[PDB]
Structure 1
């Protein structure tokens, strides 16, 4: 379209769990970006409009994996937009310690917009443009509905699972250094001279000592993901009914080896490939609109039961040879989808390169909207 401005880098990034987003960090009034801040990673695209608005071009080159994988030596890349985040306005008028404690418990976004409640019914819609230049063997998730773990739910060194209050978790953090989900003894960093280090505020610099037996809920597979892997486009739903998620339970369906709508299961998890299609058959160089309806599974909290299964419906619309096409790729399928958490789920789209892959990824996304139903 316009050449006065074509590709405009959007380099501001926000850690939604630990920080509120500043005004100059919010994109188009409804997104914040997460991941590598390389200029070419995320750019507003005036050359490819969707709904009369510039779209978002995401790109991860072969050397853009800035994160570590689940296994030693492995890595992963990320450049996404998150619909859920808190702003300073969300904490305006409250005592300063509310925000301070939210940062410590990693629940800042609990005070922001963008998340749906547990067991709710929601409609989502978004569009993606996959250029013919995208390698068929990329391993990337381009849209996902992410969980919001119980940040104060822990397991004592004796094995008991307890939901602490914000204040109690804050107290625990005074003596426990949590590396993701595992708790370690908090050790005071010392320099070569043997003198204790000091952060910007003059406080000691802590480091992780040995494991101290404490665990906190963190991580977990995304309840719903749209992506490419092994030469296939797929839609995968995950369910975790355990009250305190077990990261060691690797129940995760392989798009190519798992039959459609037949969940792979463990005691507490269920992973379902709701739909799969050879990459070559995925429409290229055109905007594809996905209409997704989700009835989130209702869980029993401490009871760890499935109170009510969920449901997933997906429609895929695009223009072919000059005519409107709409495929009902996931037809009102009863399914287990979600996590047994207090909080619900939030949407993200862009690039999440997984499977220890470094294959270049580049495509455009746009037109997100969510409604109640």
Structure 2
């Protein structure tokens, strides 16, 4: 209720486990995820894109709030997600639909903003990298993220089963899932000898030993635009395993990997579709990317590539007076996607990876997305 040159957008939504309230939605189409510090995300009336304010994202050195895969690893996040559900997506349904969705982390499957498996889509967004950004940042600024099968499990007998939502809710009563791995659900004892309770009543557990159950969770993003090691890069990832193997690292290093030569494992491929030295990426101007994706088609339980995907990217900006359009990924056949039931959704902002704490600050704007 007081206009400034930068206005913090501090509401955050857990899109897997919670519907977005009307007052958390941004510009009618986004919700924010990651650290809620006022400076992390602001509407920027000082740097306009298409004559409208843009979104200024910033993580400072201390803003890593998240844990990485490797021990003692951290990561930092302030992003917008184009995919979330609202209370209107559940209105009129039985009350247990939303309750069980929060439990299985499937609330967002009931909302807008995801494209289907194996579909064709066009995306466009714009970014502004100021001169002030350090050439050693390690950050992803736009990504298309997958949607894991939340009730797909491996039993303690090594068999892969797709549970119903109800069956999974039952499993969760006796299994404490540490990200993707099931653990004995041990009642946690307070120092008094008594069962500890949540802040707001709920009973609290902790993981005992691995109990044999696994669930699909996480995984690399199928497409990511970022900077790392002094390079701008576009990286596409493919996972054709029905149940993702979280331990199968297959993640191409941009600086060591040539373009369009996939790094592969039995089931995964990570491909650098494009890279450019940081010094050569245009600074202090708005750059517009137009991305066409034909998502790879996978064979589900057969774990096959039914049809490879395709990626095309144009990069447009003004230089010294005129329009420049560079066809930086030219209609490339590529493996891109994940073998899941559900498809993919877009996010932009700062996703600080590779255990980096170098500050990051840049602006993003102008997203649209069309079924074509």
TM-score normalised per structure 2:
0.98
Mean Cα displacement is larger for which, 55-64 or 194-203?
Answer: 194-203
Deviation at 1:202, TM superposition (A): 4.4
**1:97 alignment partner, SS class:** helix
Distance 2:10 2:50 in 1: 24
Distance 2:199 2:287 in 1: 48
Distance 2:75 2:352 in 1: 6
Residue 6 of structure 2 corresponds to which residue in structure 1? 7
Distance 1:288 1:207 in 2: 47
Query: How far does the alpha carbon of each residue in 1:77-125 deviate from its partner, in whole angstroms, 9 at most, with x for none?
Result: 0000000000000000001100000000000000010000000000000
Q: Which segments of 5 or more consecutive residues in structure 2 lack a partner in the other structure?
A: none
Query: Aligned residues, how many?
Result: 372
Deviation at 1:203, TM superposition (A): 4.3
Deviation at 1:200, TM superposition (A): 5.6
Distance 1:166 1:201 in 2: 26
Query: How far does the alpha carbon of each residue in 1:152-200 deviate from its partner, in whole angstroms, 9 at most, with x for none?
Result: 0000011000011101101111110111000011111221221222336
**2:283 alignment partner, SS class:** coil
Distance 2:196 2:320 in 1: 66
Distance 1:192 1:358 in 2: 36
Deviation at 1:19, TM superposition (A): 0.3
**2:48 alignment partner, SS class:** strand
Q: After TM superposition, list the pairs within 5 Å mapping 1:244-323 onto structure 2.
A: 244-323=243-322
Distance 1:291 1:3, change over 3 A: farther
Over the aligned positions, Cα root-mean-square deviation in angstroms equals 1.3
Deviation at 1:335, TM superposition (A): 0.4
Distance 2:8 2:200 in 1: 33
Deviation at 1:357, TM superposition (A): 0.5
**2:142 alignment partner, SS class:** strand
Distance 2:72 2:296 in 1: 36
Distance 1:99 1:131, change over 3 A: same
Deviation at 1:206, TM superposition (A): 1.6
Distance 1:4 1:211, change over 3 A: closer
Q: Which segments of 5 or more consecutive residues in structure 1 lack a partner in the other structure?
A: none
**1:341 alignment partner, SS class:** coil
Query: How far does the alpha carbon of each residue in 1:132-170 deviate from its partner, in whole angstroms, 9 at most, with x for none?
Result: 110011000000000000000000011000011101101
Residue 23 of structure 1 corresponds to which residue in structure 2? 22
Deviation at 1:69, TM superposition (A): 1.5
